[PDB]
Design a protein around this ligand. Structure first.
Ligand code: MN
Ligand code: MN
Ligand code: MN
Ligand code: MN
Lengths: 443, 444
């Protein structure tokens, strides 16, 4: 990588150690998706391993008001994951030391001198591809605990940073984790929950890498498996070798991606591969069941796990319906983006995910950035997704949504390839065109 | 301390004396938790000490109907503890004199020259911190009996009014109880039932001050004690001095609050410290078993005590399960609150207690107000708890739940730090979503 970062990391480990040695409790603030929860987990696990204590809050968006509420509180160290780069001035106004582990672009003023800021953008690395919050937290805790590297990669997968191989600092973290013996790599089919789910359901629930015709369609996948003569009520490992080969052959025909690298760790045995864990965390996060998510990251797997797996199941079911909806009513295309709108509470939480999946499946034109829109009474939650070719063409959704949302007194941001915003429902049209214009621009 | 409240207290003592001298039986109505039972005990002890007679009814909630049923009955004096401030008009409609000893925000109405109302809120004091029903009853009976001060503090502890030291009128009552020689203060570890329970169980049952990792977990605490090399099957006082020192060192590392002030009285020797007594009463109250709680308060300790300690054991066991349940199914967080929902009767009676303990332990984020929810066929019972930093930030659960509930034809109220409500199942989501905003305006 560029050895610079590792250094910045170490600065942050030093600070962390200082405060732990003094007995003071560490305040952790993070985001509510796979990356945010796995980042919070990395840090809390590092603290735990030093017989230290931590206080975690999970937020869906960091707000100026919330930062002020903290500036009260008698905590000596604040650790921010997956947010904060946009509020560096405001955060600097905290009494007490601060670490910010984040991977969004600038944001933007200077960052005070009692604050440690780790961000791939600052070290010549791409925050959209080469590192996520969870990995940034690992670099911050790497000299204290290396057992956490699998979780670091959970967040990276969660944030869609696997682009045929891990790249940049994610590659570094993978390599290390192998070297430390806590991560194994296998070539295999990338099917959903292969250890806990019968083949027909596993195929239907393989949303990424997507399998057009089969993904999201229990009937068609059951059918498909009969047509090719492969048992559809057994779990993948309980198949015969011959059946495995025929299956590998026929699914690859539908999408070559389906076969490739698969990541496992003794830590997550009986649950899933690393991508599966990312899914379980997304389901916990979408259900504001943050405790279950973090418990899972720290190693709780008894009642918590049952609950977590049940939440996934529901999550998956909701995704199937959402995909069916998009197939039924289409999207309206403009000139530089397309969009999809729904007042159904069923889809509020999952709009971004079904957006992404629908582009992969090519239900919708993957060349055109897709804005999913869900009403929250007076406001509308926006979830924008596109693809890596579109980012190459110059698309930056994080920028477009931030600028546009501000214009109407809203709040928005993200990365080039995925972003979100919140705006008055009343301003939806105006909003949408403005993004349109902003779009065609950078393009 | 305001002279006004001591004076108001004396007015109530005078009234009580008047009726006792006339030989009439005194009607005592109180609540069913530690504070409610200890308050009822204070009054009945003062009555007993004057060779007088009393009739006690314990209620889980005072209702308009019930007040009317009393408005019959041939009793000359009615003594309300831990309730009544919300029903002052309805109460004044009683024929016969009335004392109301309470500490809920009363906004508001008008008494009726014929009702004596003692409440810290009326005298510039905080009902959430500076005085509870039991202390308010003590101020009402203070010029007739001072041996009751320990019980007054039992209710205060029960109502979670120890905030690093007693404050306000509770501090006054403590100081007076020392001066009278009925209360002693020690620095020591604040472990559950140290005189009657082996160390591993004592640590597992120390719910407050909470000990993360150990509290509620028999296996872990047994383990912990082996790990540090301290006898785990012996009672705290039967340990060696060296063992005591090592233990004091290793528990303080987990929570500094575990060592600090401890309150005792010859009255409760062989049973527990004052916080232990609060626990026994909560157990009696949660099981009904009101006659036993009150027996304990009056000094009955033979068969009654055995029964009481058996009940505590069961209560504590239920709390352990409830905590485990929260650990298993988590809470869903929203903007300004979190909540937990159950269909079990195992947890009905204890929802609010395990809510409080889980926040102390930080199973759940203590910065965020926690709403426990249990279904009653058509309605759902709500138990809300939060912490003192949150109340500082501006949270008031009593208010939030009262308003919100009403807005759906429900009924709700309490204090800033703890409250309850009852609403139609048919619209939880609306209810929850309305409280989550009322709190944003509170903390904004
Ligand atoms: Mn995130
Ligand atoms: Mn992220
Ligand atoms: Mn009470
Ligand atoms: Mn009370």
């Amino acid at each position: 990588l560029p050895d610079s970062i590792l250094k910045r990391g170490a600065e942050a480990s030093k600070v962390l150690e200082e405060h732990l040695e003094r007995g003071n409790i560490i305040r952790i603030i993070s985001h509510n998706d796979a990356d945010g929860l796995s980042a919070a987990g990395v840090v809390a696990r590092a603290i735990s391993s030093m017989n230290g204590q931590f206080h975690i809050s999970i937020l869906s968006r960091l707000k100026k008001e919330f930062i002020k509420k903290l500036s009260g509180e008698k905590y000596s160290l604040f650790f921010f994951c997956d947010m904060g780069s946009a509020y560096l001035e405001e955060i600097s106004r905290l009494k007490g030391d601060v670490i910010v582990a984040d991977h969004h672009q600038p944001s933007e003023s200077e960052a005070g001198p009692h604050v440690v800021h780790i961000n791939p953008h600052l070290h010549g690395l791409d925050g959209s591809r080469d590192l996520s919050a969870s990995g940034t937290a690992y670099l911050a805790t790497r000299l204290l605990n290396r057992k956490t590297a699998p979780l670091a990669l959970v967040g990276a997968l969660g944030d869609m940073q696997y682009t045929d191989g891990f790249t940049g600092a994610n590659r570094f973290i993978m390599e290390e984790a192998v070297e430390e013996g806590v991560l194994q790599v296998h070539s295999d089919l990338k099917l959903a929950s292969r250890y806990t789910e019968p083949l027909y359901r596993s195929i239907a629930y393989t949303f990424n890498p997507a399998l057009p015709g089969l993904t999201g369609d229990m009937e068609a996948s059951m059918g498909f498996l009969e047509n090719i003569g492969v048992s559809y009520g057994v779990k993948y490992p309980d198949l015969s070798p011959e059946e495995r080969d025929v299956l590998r052959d026929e699914l690859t025909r539908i999408n070559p991606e389906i076969f490739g690298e698969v990541f496992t760790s003794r830590e997550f045995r009986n649950i899933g591969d690393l991508s599966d864990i990312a899914g379980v965390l997304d389901a916990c996060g979408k259900n504001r069941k943050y405790g279950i998510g973090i418990g899972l990251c720290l190693g709780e797997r008894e009642g918590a796990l049952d609950v977590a797996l049940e939440l996934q199941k529901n999550y998956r079911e909701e995704l199937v319906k959402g995909l069916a909806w998009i197939r039924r009513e289409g999207s309206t295309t403009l000139e530089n983006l397309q969009y999809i709108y729904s007042e159904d509470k069923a889809f509020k939480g999952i709009m971004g995910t079904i957006a992404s999946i629908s582009l992969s499946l090519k239900i919708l034109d993957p060349d055109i950035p897709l804005l999913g829109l869900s009403r929250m009474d007076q406001h509308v939650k926006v979830s924008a997704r596109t693809t890596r070719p579109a980012v190459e063409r110059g698309v930056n959704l994080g920028v477009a949504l931030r600028d546009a949302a501000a214009s109407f007194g809203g709040t928005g941001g993200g990365h080039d390839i995925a972003a979100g915003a919140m705006v008055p429902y009343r301003d939806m049209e105006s909003f949408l065109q403005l993004v349109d214009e902003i779009l065609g621009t950078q393009t």
